[PDB]
Scaffold this active site. Structure first.
Site, short mmCIF file in Angstrom:
data_model
loop_
_atom_site.label_atom_id
_atom_site.label_comp_id
_atom_site.label_asym_id
_atom_site.label_seq_id
_atom_site.Cartn_x
_atom_site.Cartn_y
_atom_site.Cartn_z
N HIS A 107 1.06 1.38 -5.71
CA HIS A 107 -0.26 0.74 -5.75
C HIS A 107 -1.34 1.75 -6.15
O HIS A 107 -2.25 1.41 -6.92
CB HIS A 107 -0.58 0.11 -4.40
CG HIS A 107 -2.04 -0.20 -4.22
ND1 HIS A 107 -2.75 -0.98 -5.11
CD2 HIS A 107 -2.91 0.17 -3.26
CE1 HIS A 107 -4.00 -1.07 -4.70
NE2 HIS A 107 -4.13 -0.39 -3.58
N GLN A 109 -4.41 -17.08 -2.15
CA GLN A 109 -4.68 -16.33 -3.37
C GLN A 109 -5.90 -16.87 -4.10
O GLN A 109 -6.76 -16.09 -4.54
CB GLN A 109 -3.45 -16.36 -4.29
CG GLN A 109 -2.29 -15.49 -3.82
CD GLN A 109 -2.63 -14.01 -3.85
OE1 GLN A 109 -3.25 -13.49 -2.93
NE2 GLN A 109 -2.22 -13.33 -4.91
N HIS A 147 -6.97 6.87 -2.83
CA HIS A 147 -7.78 5.99 -1.98
C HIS A 147 -6.99 5.30 -0.88
O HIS A 147 -7.61 4.63 -0.04
CB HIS A 147 -8.49 4.95 -2.85
CG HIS A 147 -7.61 3.80 -3.24
ND1 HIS A 147 -6.81 3.83 -4.36
CD2 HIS A 147 -7.41 2.59 -2.67
CE1 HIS A 147 -6.15 2.69 -4.46
NE2 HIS A 147 -6.49 1.92 -3.45
N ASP A 148 -5.66 5.42 -0.84
CA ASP A 148 -4.87 4.76 0.19
C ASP A 148 -3.86 5.71 0.84
O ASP A 148 -2.84 5.25 1.36
CB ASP A 148 -4.15 3.54 -0.37
CG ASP A 148 -4.97 2.28 -0.26
OD1 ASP A 148 -5.80 2.19 0.67
OD2 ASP A 148 -4.79 1.37 -1.10
N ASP A 163 -9.00 -1.35 -7.69
CA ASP A 163 -8.26 -1.49 -6.44
C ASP A 163 -7.57 -2.84 -6.35
O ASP A 163 -6.47 -2.94 -5.79
CB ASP A 163 -9.20 -1.30 -5.25
CG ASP A 163 -8.46 -1.21 -3.93
OD1 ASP A 163 -7.38 -0.59 -3.89
OD2 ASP A 163 -8.97 -1.75 -2.92
N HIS A 203 0.82 -1.20 0.00
CA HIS A 203 0.00 0.00 0.00
C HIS A 203 0.86 1.26 0.00
O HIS A 203 0.98 1.95 1.02
CB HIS A 203 -0.95 -0.01 1.20
CG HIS A 203 -1.98 -1.09 1.13
ND1 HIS A 203 -1.93 -2.22 1.91
CD2 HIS A 203 -3.09 -1.21 0.35
CE1 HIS A 203 -2.96 -2.99 1.62
NE2 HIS A 203 -3.68 -2.40 0.68
C1 LIG Z 1 0.57 -13.40 3.87
O1 LIG Z 1 0.46 -13.37 2.45
C2 LIG Z 1 -0.79 -13.27 1.92
C3 LIG Z 1 -1.96 -13.37 2.65
C4 LIG Z 1 -3.19 -13.21 2.02
C5 LIG Z 1 -3.27 -12.94 0.66
C6 LIG Z 1 -4.61 -12.74 -0.03
C7 LIG Z 1 -5.73 -12.31 0.93
C8 LIG Z 1 -5.56 -10.87 1.39
C9 LIG Z 1 -5.51 -9.96 0.18
C10 LIG Z 1 -6.04 -8.68 0.20
N1 LIG Z 1 -5.94 -7.82 -0.81
C11 LIG Z 1 -5.30 -8.23 -1.95
C12 LIG Z 1 -5.16 -7.32 -3.02
C13 LIG Z 1 -4.50 -7.67 -4.17
C14 LIG Z 1 -3.96 -8.95 -4.31
C15 LIG Z 1 -3.25 -9.31 -5.51
N2 LIG Z 1 -2.67 -9.63 -6.44
C16 LIG Z 1 -4.09 -9.87 -3.29
C17 LIG Z 1 -4.76 -9.53 -2.09
C18 LIG Z 1 -4.89 -10.42 -0.98
N3 LIG Z 1 -4.49 -11.74 -1.08
C19 LIG Z 1 -6.85 -8.23 1.38
C20 LIG Z 1 -7.54 -9.42 2.00
N4 LIG Z 1 -6.54 -10.42 2.40
C21 LIG Z 1 -6.48 -10.92 3.65
C22 LIG Z 1 -7.64 -10.67 4.57
O2 LIG Z 1 -5.50 -11.55 4.02
C23 LIG Z 1 -2.09 -12.85 -0.07
C24 LIG Z 1 -0.87 -13.02 0.55
CL1 LIG Z 1 0.58 -12.95 -0.40
MG LIG Z 2 -7.53 0.46 1.00
ZN LIG Z 3 -5.98 0.02 -2.29
#
Ligand SMILES: COc1ccc([C@H]2C[C@H]3c4c(nc5ccc(C#N)cc5c4N2)CCN3C(C)=O)cc1Cl
Ligand SMILES: [Mg+2]
Ligand SMILES: [Zn+2]
Length: 287
Positions: free
Chosen positions: A81, A245, A117-118, A212, A77
């Site tokens: 981004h 993922q 937005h961030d 986003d 962030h």
């Molecule tokens: C420790 O490592 C990780 C742990 C979780 C994730 C997962 C879920 C994760 C997440 C979030 N936003 C993302 C935005 C973009 C991308 C891409 N490309 C991927 C996103 C994303 N991946 C927020 C929600 N979230 C939560 C609650 O853990 C990835 C990695 Cl590597």
């Molecule tokens: Mg945000």
């Molecule tokens: Zn964002």
């Protein structure tokens, strides 16, 4: 001012040279100055500098103010981004042909919100957050020499602020989960009509979340590198990754990008790249 003098005097390359129209755009080879030029080109080629009479030096100072208010020590962030979220917004309005379905004030607010937005994010480990991001967006918009919206009337300015505020508020994934079911129900019934202001406002919220999370749609070598940055933020405060993922793509992304393609078929590369990345992460998950 040493940076602003060099940015203001530069020539802003065309949108085709900067490759900011491709949904597959990446920024790993770009200086902080190059991202600024790509941002000016976004405002310019969306006719935002012209339709709203933006002085060049003010837009240059505003972009640098926004970029400076992102934290470089935050792995994901950060300014990069926000720059990418704005790029996907540009690619959606242009290549995705969403331009004709929106007004200038809406496009002007979407570009500003995507870039903002961030603001001042400190990493996942630190709906209040989005209200702080709009607060910082508003403070920069009112900073001397940064007021890129001065060419707007007070009615135009107040409408644009409302749209900017909602768009930044929309990047709360909780708000997306609260509202996406409505957007999917109206996409189902063939009833979706952007003429409805409540439906247009809802769509702008969904378009924000789509840009986003645009990283999940990037080509595999890029997506692998971005997923690294995400891990470094969540994990190392700066194996389990492939499964998380696929779960994120399943729960959050695939329906959103599917619904966006129904609104405009030319936004399909987002849905496509999001599926190819599900295949790649699913294979990795199975070892
Ligand atoms: C420790 O490592 C990780 C742990 C979780 C994730 C997962 C879920 C994760 C997440 C979030 N936003 C993302 C935005 C973009 C991308 C891409 N490309 C991927 C996103 C994303 N991946 C927020 C929600 N979230 C939560 C609650 O853990 C990835 C990695 Cl590597
Ligand atoms: Mg945000
Ligand atoms: Zn964002």
């Amino acid at each position: 001012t040493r940076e602003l003098q060099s940015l203001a005097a530069a020539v802003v390359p065309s949108a085709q040279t900067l490759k900011i129209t491709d949904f597959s755009f990446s920024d790993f080879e770009l200086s902080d100055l190059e991202t600024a030029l790509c941002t000016i080109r976004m405002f310019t080629d969306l006719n935002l500098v012209q339709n709203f009479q933006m002085k060049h030096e003010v837009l240059c100072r505003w972009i640098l103010s926004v970029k400076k208010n992102y934290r470089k020590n935050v792995a994901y962030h950060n300014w990069r981004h926000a720059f990418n979220t704005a790029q996907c917004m540009f690619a959606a309005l242009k290549a995705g042909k969403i331009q004709n379905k929106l007004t200038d004030l809406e496009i002007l607010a979407l570009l500003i919100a995507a870039l903002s937005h961030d603001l001042d994010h400190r990493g996942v480990n630190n709906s209040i957050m989005e209200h702080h991001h709009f607060d910082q967006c508003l403070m920069i918009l009112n900073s001397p020499g940064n007021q890129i919206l001065s060419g707007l009337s007070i009615e135009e300015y107040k409408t644009t602020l409302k749209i900017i505020k909602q768009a930044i508020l929309a990047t709360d994934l909780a708000l997306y989960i609260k509202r996406r079911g409505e957007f999917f129900e109206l996409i189902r019934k063939n009833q979706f009509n952007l003429e409805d202001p409540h439906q247009k406002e809802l769509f702008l919220a969904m378009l924000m979340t789509a840009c986003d999370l645009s990283a999940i749609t990037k080509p595999w070598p890029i997506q692998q590198r971005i997923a690294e940055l995400v891990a470094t933020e969540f994990f190392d405060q700066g194996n389990k990754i492939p499964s998380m993922q696929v779960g994120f793509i399943d729960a959050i992304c695939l329906q959103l990008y599917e619904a966006l393609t129904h609104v405009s078929e030319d936004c399909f590369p987002l849905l496509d790249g999001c599926r190819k990345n599900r295949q790649k992460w699913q294979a990795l998950a199975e070892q």
